[PDB]
Write a protein that holds these residues in place. Structure first.
Motif, PDB file in Angstrom:
ATOM      1  N   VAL A   1      14.891  -1.253  10.378  1.00 49.56           N
ATOM      2  CA  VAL A   1      13.811  -1.056  10.358  1.00 49.56           C
ATOM      3  C   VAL A   1      13.142   0.141   9.105  1.00 49.56           C
ATOM      4  CG1 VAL A   1      14.707   0.540  11.846  1.00 49.56           C
ATOM      5  CG2 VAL A   1      12.393   0.495  11.925  1.00 49.56           C
ATOM      6  N   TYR A   2      14.183   1.519   9.003  1.00 48.11           N
ATOM      7  CA  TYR A   2      14.319   2.212   8.338  1.00 48.11           C
ATOM      8  C   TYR A   2      13.664   1.357   7.283  1.00 48.11           C
ATOM      9  CZ  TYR A   2      16.467   5.100   4.328  1.00 48.11           C
ATOM     10  OH  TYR A   2      16.282   5.599   3.322  1.00 48.11           O
TER      11      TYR A   2
ATOM     12  N   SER B   1       9.979   1.229   7.199  1.00 50.37           N
ATOM     13  CA  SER B   1       9.379   2.583   7.072  1.00 50.37           C
ATOM     14  C   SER B   1       9.202   2.716   5.756  1.00 50.37           C
ATOM     15  CB  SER B   1      10.228   4.043   7.870  1.00 50.37           C
ATOM     16  OG  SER B   1      10.914   4.482   6.852  1.00 50.37           O
ATOM     17  N   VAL B   2      10.327   3.702   5.094  1.00 49.50           N
ATOM     18  CA  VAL B   2      10.047   3.673   3.721  1.00 49.50           C
ATOM     19  C   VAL B   2       9.740   3.329   2.415  1.00 49.50           C
ATOM     20  CG1 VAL B   2      11.050   3.506   1.617  1.00 49.50           C
ATOM     21  CG2 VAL B   2      12.004   5.697   3.119  1.00 49.50           C
TER      22      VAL B   2
ATOM     23  N   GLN C   1       6.370   1.225   4.116  1.00 53.20           N
ATOM     24  CA  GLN C   1       5.111   1.793   4.480  1.00 53.20           C
ATOM     25  C   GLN C   1       4.738   3.161   4.114  1.00 53.20           C
ATOM     26  OE1 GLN C   1       6.757   1.702   8.398  1.00 53.20           O
ATOM     27  NE2 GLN C   1       7.175  -0.270   8.004  1.00 53.20           N
ATOM     28  N   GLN C   2       5.749   4.173   4.089  1.00 49.58           N
ATOM     29  CA  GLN C   2       5.397   5.379   3.651  1.00 49.58           C
ATOM     30  C   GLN C   2       5.001   4.887   1.853  1.00 49.58           C
ATOM     31  OE1 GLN C   2       8.242   8.557   4.820  1.00 49.58           O
ATOM     32  NE2 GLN C   2       6.683   9.724   3.136  1.00 49.58           N
ATOM     33  N   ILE C   3       5.464   4.509   1.357  1.00 50.14           N
ATOM     34  CA  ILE C   3       5.311   4.356   0.519  1.00 50.14           C
ATOM     35  C   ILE C   3       3.704   4.091   0.041  1.00 50.14           C
ATOM     36  CG2 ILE C   3       6.016   2.936  -2.186  1.00 50.14           C
ATOM     37  CD1 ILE C   3       9.316   3.708  -1.228  1.00 50.14           C
TER      38      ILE C   3
ATOM     39  N   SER D   1       1.296   3.118   1.968  1.00 48.03           N
ATOM     40  CA  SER D   1       0.382   3.986   2.187  1.00 48.03           C
ATOM     41  C   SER D   1       0.218   4.946   1.896  1.00 48.03           C
ATOM     42  CB  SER D   1       0.624   4.284   3.848  1.00 48.03           C
ATOM     43  OG  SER D   1       0.095   5.351   4.395  1.00 48.03           O
ATOM     44  N   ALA D   2       1.444   5.817   1.076  1.00 47.09           N
ATOM     45  CA  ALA D   2       0.801   7.738   0.472  1.00 47.09           C
ATOM     46  C   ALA D   2       0.360   6.895  -1.404  1.00 47.09           C
ATOM     47  CB  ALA D   2       1.797   7.667   0.008  1.00 47.09           C
TER      48      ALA D   2
ATOM     49  N   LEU E   1      -2.498   3.843  -1.518  1.00 47.40           N
ATOM     50  CA  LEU E   1      -3.611   3.376  -1.119  1.00 47.40           C
ATOM     51  C   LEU E   1      -4.226   4.277  -0.939  1.00 47.40           C
ATOM     52  CD1 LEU E   1      -5.710   1.648   0.197  1.00 47.40           C
ATOM     53  CD2 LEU E   1      -4.394   1.986   2.213  1.00 47.40           C
ATOM     54  N   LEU E   2      -4.387   5.855  -0.090  1.00 49.09           N
ATOM     55  CA  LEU E   2      -4.565   6.140   0.055  1.00 49.09           C
ATOM     56  C   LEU E   2      -5.138   7.364  -1.150  1.00 49.09           C
ATOM     57  CD1 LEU E   2      -6.202   9.076   1.181  1.00 49.09           C
ATOM     58  CD2 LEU E   2      -4.092  10.214   1.810  1.00 49.09           C
TER      59      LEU E   2
ATOM     60  N   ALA F   1       2.269   3.682   9.445  1.00 46.55           N
ATOM     61  CA  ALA F   1       3.396   4.527   9.020  1.00 46.55           C
ATOM     62  C   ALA F   1       4.402   5.861   9.910  1.00 46.55           C
ATOM     63  CB  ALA F   1       3.377   5.101   7.028  1.00 46.55           C
TER      64      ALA F   1
ATOM     65  N   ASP G   1       6.167   4.403  12.795  1.00 46.36           N
ATOM     66  CA  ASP G   1       7.447   3.373  12.127  1.00 46.36           C
ATOM     67  C   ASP G   1       8.074   4.566  12.136  1.00 46.36           C
TER      68      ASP G   1
ATOM     69  N   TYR H   1      19.927  11.048   5.715  1.00 42.31           N
ATOM     70  CA  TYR H   1      18.349  10.069   5.867  1.00 42.31           C
ATOM     71  C   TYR H   1      17.272  10.978   6.422  1.00 42.31           C
ATOM     72  CZ  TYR H   1      15.040   7.200   8.413  1.00 42.31           C
ATOM     73  OH  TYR H   1      14.099   6.813   9.080  1.00 42.31           O
TER      74      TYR H   1
END
Lengths: 163, 31, 164, 30, 158, 158
Positions: free
Chosen positions: A4-5, A8-9, A11-13, A15-16, A18-19, B12, B15, C4
Motif C-alpha cells: 500500500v505504501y 501511495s508514493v 499516486q502522490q508522484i 498526482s503532483a 498532473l496538477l 492520494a 491513501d 518512512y
C-alpha cells in the motif's frame, strides 16, 4: 503493507505531476486571455472621451440655436409689434397664439388649397380694456372669421392700423 | 478535467491516511 | 516505519508549497478576472447612457429646427419680410433682409445705452428695369444709408410696406 | 470559486484525519 | 479540547455542504447551455439541407437548359448551312466567326462584314470569285435591318 | 460519531457524482461546439457555390437569349417552344417580316409541316393567301434534307 505504501508514493508522484502540468497550462492560457481584456478596456475608454466631446458641442449648438430663436423673436416684437407665443396641431390644423398691438389684442390663428381662421382670445381681461378695445376695433374683429391665406397680410395691417 | 486532476490529489491524500491507519494498527499490535 | 513517516512528511511539505502557491497564483487570477468583468460592464453601462444622450439631443435639435423654418415661413407669409442671416463684426450685429427690396440693418450698442439701427439697402442682385420700377415706388432717401433710434423702427418698416 | 470551495472541503476532511491520527497519538502516549 | 475538535469537524463539514450546493448550480446551468446548442445545431441542419436542394436543382436546370441550347444550335446549323464558331468582345463590339465562305461579323446598332480567307487553296479562292462578287471580298457596313438580306444573297450565290 | 460520518459521507458522495457529471457535461458540450463549426463552414461553402451557380446558369440562359436574340435579328424566325408527345417532338415557329405561325414535328428521319392560324384577323389571312402558295397552309411531309429548302421558300414569299 509495503504494498500500500508503494501505491501511495506512486499516486502522490502522479498526482503532483498532473496538477503542475494542467495548472501551468491554465495559467498560461489565463495570462494570454488577460492582455486582450486589458486592450479591450483601453479601447472602451476612448469611445467615452469621444462621446463627451460630441455631447458638449451638441449642447452648446442647441443652446446657441435657441439663443437665435429668442433673439429672432425679440426683433420681430420690436419691429412688427407682434409676437407668436406657441403652436399646436390638433389633428386637423395647426394653431398659434398671438399678441399684437402697442404696449394689445390676443388671438389665435388656425390653418387647415389652404385657408385660415381668426378667433379673438379674451379669456382674461379688465373690462376697462375690453371697452378701450371696442372703441379702437371694428366690430368684426371680435368674432371668428375665415379667409384664404392671400388675405392674411391684409388682415395683419388692418389690426395694426387700428391699434 | 481540472476537478478530475484535483480528485487525484484527494485520492492520494486518502491513501496516505490509509497507510497511517495501517501503521497505526500495527503499532498498536506491537505495543 | 519511523524513517518512512519522516520521508513522507518532507515530501508532503514540498508538494504543498508547490501546489498551494500555484493555487494561490491561480485564485488571484480568478478573483481578478471577476473584477475585470465587473469594471468592463460598468464602462459599458456609461457608454449606452452617453449614446442615448447624443440620440436624444439630435432629435430635440432636429425637432426644434423644424420650428425655426416653419416660423420663418409664417413671418414671410404674414409680414412679407424675411431675415436671411446674422453677423457680429466687432461692434454691431447685422441682418440681411428681403421685404422686393433687399437691405441690411445694423445695431449700435453702448454709448447712451440706447440701440441705434443703421439702414443701408443692398441690391446685390438686380436688373436695371426693377431698379427703376423701385425708384418709382420708393422715396429716394430709403436707398441711402440712414440712422434712427430703435423706437422708430416699426415706423420705418411700415413706410416700406405701404410703398411696396 | 470552484477551486476555493474544493480546497476548503478537502482541507476540512484533512483536519478530521489529523484529529483521528492524534486520538491515537494520545493513546500511544498513555 | 475535544470541544474544539468537534467544532472543527463541524465547520469543515458545513462549508463542504456549501461547496456541494455551489457545484449543483454549475450542473443546473450546464444542461441549459447544452440544450440551447442542440437547437442551433438543428437550424443549421435544416438550412444545410435546404441549401443542398438549391444546388442540386440549379445543377439539373443548368444541365437541362444546356442540352436544349445545344440541340437548337445543331438543328439551326444543319437546316441553315451556316454555323457560328465563336464569340469575342474586344472592348467595343462583339464578333462571331461564321462558316464555303468563312467570315466574321462585328456589332458596335450597326454591323460589319469582313472576308476571312486566312487559309485557302487558291483553286477555291477562284472557284469562289466566280460565284460571288468582289465587293463581298471587302469589308462592309450595314444596319442590322439589312442583315437577313445579306445572308440570303450569299446563300443564293453558293 | 455515526452522524458526522453519514453526513460527510453523503457530502463526498454528492461531490463525486457532481464532479463526474461535470466531466461528462463539459465533454458532451465541447464536442457539440465543434459540430456547430463544421456546419457553419459548410453553409458558407454552399453560399459561395450557390451564388456562383446562379450567374453561370443565368448568363448561359441569358447567353442563349443573346443567341436567340441574334437568330431572331438574322433569320426572321423564332422558335417559341418544344413538346414531346410520345412519338415526335414539336416546335412552334414564327417566321416572316414585321408573319406565318406554324409547327414542325419530327418522328431514318422525317418531318411534318402544319400551319397554325388558331387566331388571325381575316384581313391578314388574305394578305397571306396572296403572298403564299396555297399548299404551305395544308399539312405536309418531307425528309429532313428538304427542310432548309422549305425555309427558303417561305422567306422568299414573305
Amino acid at each position: 503493507p509495503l504494498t500500500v505504501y508503494k501505491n501511495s508514493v506512486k499516486q502522490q508522484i502522479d498526482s503532483a505531476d498532473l496538477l503542475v502540468a494542467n495548472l501551468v497550462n491554465e495559467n498560461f492560457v489565463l495570462s494570454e486571455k488577460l492582455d486582450t481584456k486589458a486592450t479591450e478596456i483601453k479601447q472602451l475608454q476612448k469611445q467615452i472621451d469621444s462621446l463627451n466631446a460630441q455631447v458638449k458641442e451638441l449642447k452648446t449648438q442647441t443652446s446657441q440655436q435657441a439663443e437665435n430663436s429668442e433673439v429672432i423673436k425679440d426683433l420681430y416684437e420690436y419691429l412688427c409689434n407682434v409676437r407668436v407665443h406657441k403652436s399646436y396641431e390638433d389633428d386637423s390644423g395647426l394653431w398659434f397664439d398671438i399678441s399684437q398691438g402697442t404696449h394689445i389684442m390676443d388671438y389665435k390663428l388656425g390653418f387647415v388649397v389652404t385657408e385660415v381662421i381668426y378667433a379673438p382670445v379674451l379669456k382674461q381681461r379688465s373690462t376697462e380694456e375690453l371697452y378701450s378695445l371696442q372703441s379702437k376695433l371694428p366690430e368684426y374683429l371680435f368674432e371668428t372669421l375665415s379667409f384664404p391665406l392671400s388675405s392674411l397680410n391684409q388682415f395683419y395691417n388692418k389690426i395694426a392700423k387700428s391699434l | 478535467t481540472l476537478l478530475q486532476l484535483l480528485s487525484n490529489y484527494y485520492k492520494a491524500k486518502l491513501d496516505s491516511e490509509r497507510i497511517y491507519n495501517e501503521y497505526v494498527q500495527s503499532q498498536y499490535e506491537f505495543a
